[PDB]
A paper describes a structure:
The de novo Kennedy pathway is the main route for the PC synthesis in P. falciparum and has been identified as a pharmacological target for the treatment of malaria. In contrast, the gene of PfCCT underwent a domain duplication event and thus encodes two catalytic and two membrane binding domains connected by a disordered interdomain segment. Here, we present the crystal structures of the catalytic domain of the P. falciparum enzyme (PfCCT) in the free form, as well as in complex with its substrate ChoP or fragments (CMP and choline) and with the product CDPCho, thereby visualizing the free and the ChoP-complexed states of CCT for the first time. The enzyme forms a globular dimer with an α/β Rossmann fold that is well conserved in CCTs and other members of the cytidylyltransferase enzyme family.
Residue numbers in the entry:
A (entry chain B): 616 to 719, 738 to 773
B (entry chain A): 616 to 719, 738 to 774
Write the structure that this text describes.
């Protein structure tokens, strides 16, 4: 009854949305190991856009989060079944929103069809960027 | 054996500096209870300046940090002997820069004289605002 959970992400400018996500992942079953995958600077730039923080920084911050049991740094961009079998992963946690890879429309779709995906919910309006937006409007 | 450490703060827009301070506090001794105090919205505006996040949001964020054993929200601005009595605190953990208000040049002074203060180190250039400065200095994002 100990279920391995893999949640992957850039985890740039770690903020309460990520932390709450990691909490949902950890708490999907009574007993878990939560493995966090953090993407590389270079893949993140190729496929998404430039990263504010290096992989080292993004990895360091996540060590402070209560829910995290293990970290894979760097992690791959797309989840392969070789990868699930290597880290003994039972389910992959991430939001519902289809995640495009330029021509490939949802890199998580295979996992949903395979029965190996658990949806977590986004939290809105608490990003590191929304916080600065509040500062620039209390000025004004 | 078990030592009770009290770290107090605003803990606005929680960032790696804060987390590292808490980590240091927690690890001051082999066995500890880390109690974190989080200041009220109105006292923070009155004694320090704008607080971006409410008391509820600052409290919630700290819920997620590995080192935190207990939170006192809201906490008082100035530590008193009665407060250390109430929670059984051995040491208050904070950076060693004297912290002024209207009445005293260092609100930590009595604890420092009393052998009841543990200095933690600041970590510079990792704040939530410093991160947003790196986006803006290189708008290539
Ligand atoms: C690169 N991948 C495909 C391997 C995973 C990347 O995933 P991502 O770009 O959604 O990364 P991210 O760092 O933005 O999000 C990481 C995790 O944070 C969660 N998240 C993020 C922001 C937010 N406001 N609420 C959230 O719940 C996302 O749902 C995701 O589950
Ligand atoms: C208001 N008090 C007097 C009740 C508590 C102290 O309030 P404060 O203004 O220092 O709060 P703060 O939130 O700015 O910082 C709280 C704690 O994080 C530490 N800190 C802060 C910023 C930073 N870059 N590194 C840190 O180590 C501070 O030294 C302090 O120990």
């Amino acid at each position: 009854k100990n279920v391995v959970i893999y949640a992957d992400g850039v985890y740039d400018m770690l903020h309460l949305g990520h932390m709450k996500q990691l909490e949902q992942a950890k708490k999907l079953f009574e007993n878990t190991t939560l493995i966090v995958g953090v993407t590389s600077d270079n893949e993140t730039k190729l496929f998404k856009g430039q990263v504010v923080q290096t992989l080292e920084e993004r990895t360091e911050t996540l060590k402070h989060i209560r829910w995290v049991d293990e970290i894979i740094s760097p992690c791959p961009w797309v989840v392969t079944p070789e990868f699930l079998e290597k880290y003994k992963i039972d389910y992959v946690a991430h939001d519902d929103i289809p995640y495009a890879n330029n021509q490939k429309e949802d890199i998580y779709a295979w996992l949903k069809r395979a029965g190996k995906f658990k949806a977590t919910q986004r939290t809105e309006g608490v990003s590191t960027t929304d916080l600065i937006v509040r500062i620039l409007k209390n000025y004004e």
